[PDB]
Structure 1
Amino acid sequence: QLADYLPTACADIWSLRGQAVETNPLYWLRTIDCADRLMPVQSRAEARALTDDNWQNAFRRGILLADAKITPPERRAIVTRLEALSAQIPAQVRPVYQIWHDGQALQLALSAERQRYSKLQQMSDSELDALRQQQQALQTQLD
C-alpha cells in the first residue's frame, strides 16, 4: 500500500521533496500529468527552479521540458543524462520512468526521421536538377 499523491494540486506538486515522495510512483505519475497541463513558458519557468545534480531533479526537469518546445539536441541531452543516472532510480519508480523514457526516445526517433526526409528531399531535387540541366543542353543542341 502506497501513498496517493495524485490528488495533490498541480500548483504545489513541484515543491514537494524528500525520500517519501521521490520513491512513490504515484507522485511521479502526478508530475507528468501536471506537466502535460502547462504551457512552454510555464514549463521552462518551473524548470528554472530546478537543477540536474541528481536523478530526482533531472527527472523533474526532463518531465517539464519534454513538451516545452525543445530542440532534438536538447531532448537527447536530457535523455542521455537520465539514462546515466537511471540505475539510482528506485525499483518502484522505474516503471514510470521507463514509460516516460520510451516516449522521449520515440520523439527522438521521430525527429531523426524528419531530418532523413528533408535530406532525401534535397538529395532528390539536386539529382533532378542535374538531369534537367543535361536535358536543357541536349534540347538546345537539337534546336
Structure 2
Amino acid sequence: CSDIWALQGKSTETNPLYWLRAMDCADRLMPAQSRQQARQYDDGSWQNTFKQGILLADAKITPYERRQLVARIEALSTEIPAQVRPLYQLWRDGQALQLQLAEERQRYSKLQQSSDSELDTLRQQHHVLQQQLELTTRKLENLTDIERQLST
C-alpha cells in the first residue's frame, strides 16, 4: 500500500482497480503524510496530477488549493482512459461538491456579516432616537404642565 504510489506503465494507468486501491490507500494517510507523498509526483503527467489530487483531497487543504487541484486534472480530462473515466468522474464530482460547499459556506457568512452590521447600525440609531425622544417628551410635558397651571 506504500508501493502502490510508485506503480507506472499503461497497464496501471488504464486500470480502474489500481486507482481504486490508490484512493483507498490515500484515505489511510494523515494530512502531513499525504502532502509529503504528493511532493514526489511533480512530473506534471496526468497520472501524477491525478495521484496528487487523490492524496491532497483530504490533506486539510484550502478551498483555493482544492480549486487549483481540480483545475489541473480537469485540463487533462481527455487523457483519462475510458475504463477509468467513470471512477474519475465519481471522484471529480465529490471534489466539485466540496467546492460548492465551500462557496455556500462563504456566501452564508457574508450574508451573516452584512445583515449584522446593518442591524447593529440601525439599533444604534434607534437607541439614540429613543433617548432623544424621551428628553424632548419630558420637556414638553414639563412646560405644558407649567403653562396649564399658570393660565388657571
TM-score normalized with structure 1 length: 0.91
Q: CA deviation at 1:52?
A: 5.2
Give distance in 1, aligned partners of 2:79 and 2:43: 14
Tell me if the contact between 1:52 and 1:61 (Cα under 8 Å) persists in the aligned partners. no
Question: 1:82 maps to what in 2?
Answer: 73
Correspondence for 1:116 among 76, 94, 107: 107
Give distance in 2, aligned partners of 1:24 and 1:132: 63
Give distance in 1, aligned partners of 2:29 and 2:9: 24
Give distance in 2, aligned partners of 1:50 and 1:83: 17
Alpha-carbon RMSD: 0.9
Which residue identity lines up with residue 93 of structure 1 in the other structure?
Answer: V
Correspondence for 1:41 among 32, 36, 47: 32
Correspondence for 2:52 among 56, 61, 77: 61
Q: Any idea what SS the aligned residue of 1:124 has?
A: helix
Give distance in 2, aligned partners of 1:36 and 1:123: 38
Q: Aligned residues: percent identity?
A: 71
Which residue identity lines up with residue 117 of structure 2 in the other structure?
Answer: S
Give distance in 2, aligned partners of 1:87 and 1:129: 53
Correspondence for 1:129 among 120, 124, 128: 120
Which residue identity lines up with residue 82 of structure 2 in the other structure?
Answer: A
In structure 2, relative to structure 1, the CA distance for the partners of 1:120 and 1:59 (3 Å cut) is same
* Cα offsets for 1:73-116 (capped at 9, x unmatched): 10001111111101111100111110000000011011111101
In structure 2, relative to structure 1, the CA distance for the partners of 1:135 and 1:99 (3 Å cut) is same
* Cα offsets for 1:18-50 (capped at 9, x unmatched): 111111000001100110111001100100111
* Cα offsets for 1:52-75 (capped at 9, x unmatched): 511110000000000000001100
Question: 2:130 maps to what in 1?
Answer: 139
Question: 1:31 maps to what in 2?
Answer: 22
Runs of at least 5 residues in structure 2 that lack an aligned partner in the other structure: 135-152
Runs of at least 5 residues in structure 1 that lack an aligned partner in the other structure: 1-9
